[PDB]
Each structure stands twice: as structure tokens, then as C-alpha cells.
Amino acid sequence: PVNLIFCYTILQMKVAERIMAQHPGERFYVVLMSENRNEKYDYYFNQIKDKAEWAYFFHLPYGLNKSFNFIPTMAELKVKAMLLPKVKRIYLASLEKVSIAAFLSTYPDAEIKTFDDGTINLIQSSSYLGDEFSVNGTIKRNFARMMIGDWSIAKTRNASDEHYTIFKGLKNIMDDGRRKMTYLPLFDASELKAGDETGGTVRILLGSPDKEMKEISEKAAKNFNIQYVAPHPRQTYGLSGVTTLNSPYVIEDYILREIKKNPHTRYEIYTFFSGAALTMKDFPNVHVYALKPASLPEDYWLKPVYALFTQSGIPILTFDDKLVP
Amino acid sequence: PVNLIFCYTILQMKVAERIMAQHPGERFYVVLMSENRNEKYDYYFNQIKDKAEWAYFFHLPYGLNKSFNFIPTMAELKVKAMLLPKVKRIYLASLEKVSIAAFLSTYPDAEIKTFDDGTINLIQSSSYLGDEFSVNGTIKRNFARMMIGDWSIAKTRNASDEHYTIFKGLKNIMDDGRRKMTYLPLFDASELKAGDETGGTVRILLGSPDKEMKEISEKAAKNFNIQYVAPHPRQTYGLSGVTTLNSPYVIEDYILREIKKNPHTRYEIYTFFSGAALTMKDFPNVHVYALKPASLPEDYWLKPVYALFTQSGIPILTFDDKLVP
Numbered sequence A, B: 001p002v003n004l005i006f007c008y009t010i011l012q013m014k015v016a017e018r019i020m021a022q023h024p025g026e027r028f029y030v031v032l033m034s035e036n037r038n039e040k041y042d043y044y045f046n047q048i049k050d051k052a053e054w055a056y057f058f059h060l061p062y063g064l065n066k067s068f069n070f071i072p073t074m075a076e077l078k079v080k081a082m083l084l085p086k087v088k089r090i091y092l093a094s095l096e097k098v099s100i101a102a103f104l105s106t107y108p109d110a111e112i113k114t115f116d117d118g119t120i121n122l123i124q125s126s127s128y129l130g131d132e133f134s135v136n137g138t139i140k141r142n143f144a145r146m147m148i149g150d151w152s153i154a155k156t157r158n159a160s161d162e163h164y165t166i167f168k169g170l171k172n173i174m175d176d177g178r179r180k181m182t183y184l185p186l187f188d189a190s191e192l193k194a195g196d197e198t199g200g201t202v203r204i205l206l207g208s209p210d211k212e213m214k215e216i217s218e219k220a221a222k223n224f225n226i227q228y229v230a231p232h233p234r235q236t237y238g239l240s241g242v243t244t245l246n247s248p249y250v251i252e253d254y255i256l257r258e259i260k261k262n263p264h265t266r267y268e269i270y271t272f273f274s275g276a277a278l279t280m281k282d283f284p285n286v287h288v289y290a291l292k293p294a295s296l297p298e299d300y301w302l303k304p305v306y307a308l309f310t311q312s313g314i315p316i317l318t319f320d321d322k323l324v325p
């Protein structure tokens, strides 16, 4: 159980030091956020790093703060005035209307538009009311409590008149009557020239970011005879006995390039319920499979995941990982 | 006149690219804010940096985001759950209740306490109603409009039950009946052992951060025969013909050390109305002077500055800079 202190000036750091020296028995994490860095600043930051359990110094880009901790002069007013950019419109993920809400309000006349955060846009309001979410003090209740509140503010607090979704035909949480829904497809399957699938089958497993799916994954690769793993961008460890595909592209892009180059090849994409299955279903010559490992709990994925997948036409294969050496 | 786009995932960056490619004639600044960095992320960031008029990639500290752009698994819920720190209390500058407001609300049961931003705490509510601030479309009106709103939310939106001020005897903007005011003195003048001022006078000019006070400053140093300049921490250029004092300390600290070491020396501190004069007035053997250059406009400092200074007992000297070679 910790205390936080936030600073943005040297004198505020001296205050942080007085506050800590007054609570010798307490734990402190201390964040300095400042546009300036120099000998003077560091010296007082490092004084705080020596007393705090943890300390971080965000070195922000010049002119992000349009207010002042001091009383400004006509000079200091004019400079900030004429560097403050002139802002007509702002685009952001729906949930960023919550977390970058304080910046939004400093541009009250900017027209706002949002786009999907990701697959989290696809869980509809009522789903967060399910029994799955309604036990108490549980980790699933706290999540639902949170999203319900966050979506509320994203929908009701800084009027934005349009929402971009990348998912064709699945109801969006932001489709609330208060805004235009626009479909914006990220991926161009035309000009690919994909024909009949002769000359072979390439099998790829999508990697999981959970370091704990390493052994399930390796078994999946063996069971279904998959040669390649496409690692998750949030993924950090490796699989043994499976050729990892190293590439700067995300999977969808990489697969689009391969189809262009290999227009007769059957592509099989296996995934533990990654969002990619949803963006990829309709790709020509691509066949997507959800893998549901029997050894994980049933509640390891939220009920809405299963619904979304079968609603989207993706096979959910039961996989008996425990029967694989 | 610009458009902003904010992202926190690769797919959101692809959306940013579609949005820009659809407004070829518009200017874009694009910010990616992400906890992960790698080949995959950079590649898509650099794609955006090639189309945007400007682009910046904040590489945030792990686990700052307690929500999800994807639908999380029981694993992904548990990990975030048990890394999310346990937070009892949060300390921050009064105005940071506005700018870090969205983080505050994600800790609804944390007890909150504030401290002064700086001298800006000393301008009282009504002062922002002055004629000085009440012409229209002016830069001074916009400032007052802004502070009035910011103070309102700092005072009324995330109940905090105590405010620390570093200024003894000057009314604080946060002294609104809704909270305890506590004086927290930053600076220990006792144990200094300052005696009668014999053995000489040391004169120091406080540097201005306005690169445009360079010539006024140099003249001040010459006029009043000041040998040393203490440069501002926000200050970035140098003075000619004045020995700059290089030190990691801020002025108050540095002066405290000097008095200990030189307990019979008279210290004269000259300043164009820096906040330091307010924290320093009562230091033993320190005599502070405000310098008001005749060649600047009268409205270069806000009326409340002058009031605060004379209210605080600091001499305001008229300085005829134009009469100095």
C-alpha cells in the first residue's frame, strides 16, 4: 500500500521531500513531469530518487502545458500563446476520450472523432451485466465496473459526432444513437489476384502474449502439424520446435503480402482467440481456426469472445492438449 | 491550423494512416503512446512519421494503463490486477488535479492532498476579474478564462481535504473553506548562525528566463554594480560582463549554504519580480530588491505581482535602463 506524489517543478520536488521526510514509515512513488531538464532539475530529482521507493522523470515535449505554475509576464503569455498549435479536429480511440480527457477540454472547439480501441469495442453494454461479471470483489466485477464507467464517459462527455469501426457487421459499443458509425476497412484484399488453392497449404499459429501459453502453443504446433509461429507484438518469449516468422509486419499485413506473392497457396491461421481472426476472416485463401485448450478453465476467455467468434463464422476447435506428449 | 491523432496500438496507427491518406490537403501531428516498443511498433510508427507533419512516440512505463484495447483473458485480468499498485493517498500540485484528473478518478478511494503550484497560487479569484483581464480576444482575457476554469475544477472535483502552502501570510487561491490550509516552510533559516553584517556585501542578480531580458539584465548588473548572476533554472542563455554562478542548487538553497559559511556577509539579491523574492524575504542577512525596467511596458507584469511584492515588504526600484550605456 503506497502513496503517490506528482511534481512538475523543482520547488514542488522540495515539497515532496518534506512530505516524505514527514512520513518515514510510509512508501512513496514519486513522478516528476517536466519540459526542462538540466543540472538543477536532475539534482533535485536525484535527491528524491534517494528517498522514494520508486521515482520516474517523464521528460515531456516542449509546450504541452498551456498553464503556468508561476505568474506569467506579457512575454511568457505571448510565447505560449503563439506556440500553442491551432487545432481544428482531434482523432482518438474511443477510450482515449477518458484518459486524454483533460487535454480535450483545453480544445473546447475542436471537432472530435473517434475510432475503435480494438476488439474491446465489440462487447456490448449489457454483456457487462452478465452473471459472469456479477459476483463481488472478484477481478471480473472490477473490470466490468470500470468499463461501464469508462464507456459512459467516452459516450457522454466530449461530444464527438462520428465513430470509425474496423469491424464490418458486428455491433459496436459506441453505436449509441449519439454519433455516426462509419466502417473504415484497414485491409485491401482486392488487387491480390488470389485464385484456386493448388500448390500447397501453409500453416501458421498466432503467438500468445501470455508467457504461460508456451507449452500449450508448442503442443498445438505439434498436434495440428503447424510449421510456423507468427509472434504477437506484445509477445516476448519464444517457442521451441516451431519456426518463428520474424517480420516487422503485423500478421494481416504479412499475410496480404504472401497471398499476392503466392496466389494459389492455402493459408491456415490457428489462434487462441486473437482479434486477428476477426480482421482476417474474409481474406481470400485464408482459413482461420480458434483453438480452445481443454486444460485451461472455461472462464479463461469471457463468454462474449465465444459468441463473437461463432457470430463471425470462425470454427472453434476443442483441443485436448493433455493428450499431446 | 492542424489536426491531432492519438494512438496507443499498431492497428490504431494503421487507422491514423487511413485518416491522413483521406485528408491529403490537411496537416497532422500524430502521437503514439505505448508501453511496448519493438521492431513491429517502430515500423508502423515510422510509416506515420513519413506522412505526418510531426510525430512523437511517448514510451510509457509498464502498467500505467489499467484498461484494455482488446478483450482480456483471465490471465490478462489477473496480471494487471496484481501489478496495479495499492494506493492509499496521492499528493499533487493544486492545478494537477485538472491535468492528472483522469488518473485520480481511477483511484476513487485514495485520499488526496495538494500543494502550491507556485506563485500562481497567490493571485486571488477576483483578481482574474480585473479590467486588466477583461478586454476581449486579448491574450490576457484567455489566460483569465483558463485559470478561472482550472481553479474551479481543482477546487470542486476530486475532494481533497488539505492544501500545503509554502508562503506564510499571503492568501491562497485554494483557501476556499472547503479544505485545511497548512503552512509547510521549505527552508530552514535557523542553525545558520547569522550575525551582524560586517566583512562585506555580495550582490547577485537573479537571471530571467526571457532571452529578451539579456540586455536589461546586463545593464542592471552594471548600474547597481552587481558582480554575480544566478541563472534561472528555466534560463538558457548567458550574460556578458557578469560572473555567472554555476551550481546545482536553486537560489534559496545556495544562499542558505553561503550564509552558514559566511555569517557576517550582507547578501543583496536583485530580481525582476521572481518568485524567489517571496520565498527569500525573511532569510537572515538577505536583502531583496525588485527591479522594474522603465523601458518595458507597465503591463509587462500583471497588477497582482506589484501588489504581492509590496504587500510582502519588498522594495520595487524603478530602473532607468535607457540611461545605462
Ligand SMILES: Nc1ccn([C@@H]2O[C@H](COP(=O)(O)OP(=O)(O)O)[C@@H](O)[C@H]2O)c(=O)n1
Residues within 6 Å of the ligand: A118, A119, A205, A206, A207, A208, A230, A231, A232, A233, A234, A249, A250, A251, A252, A273, A274, A275, A276, A279, B011, B069, B070, B071
Ligand atoms: N500473433 C499475432 C497476434 C496478433 N497480431 C495483431 O494483433 C492484433 C489484435 O490481437 P489481440 O486481440 O490478441 O490483442 P491485441 O493485439 O489487440 O493487443 C491483430 O489485429 C493483429 O494485427 C499479430 O500481428 N500477430
Ligand SMILES: Nc1ccn([C@@H]2O[C@H](COP(=O)(O)OP(=O)(O)O)[C@@H](O)[C@H]2O)c(=O)n1
Residues within 6 Å of the ligand: A011, A069, A070, A071, B118, B119, B205, B206, B207, B208, B230, B231, B232, B233, B234, B249, B250, B251, B252, B273, B274, B275, B276, B279
Ligand atoms: N534566478 C533564479 C530564479 C528563480 N529560481 C528558483 O525559481 C523559483 C521561482 O521563480 P519564478 O517565479 O521567476 O518562475 P518559476 O521559478 O516559478 O518557474 C524560485 O523559488 C527559485 O528557487 C532560482 O533558483 N534562480
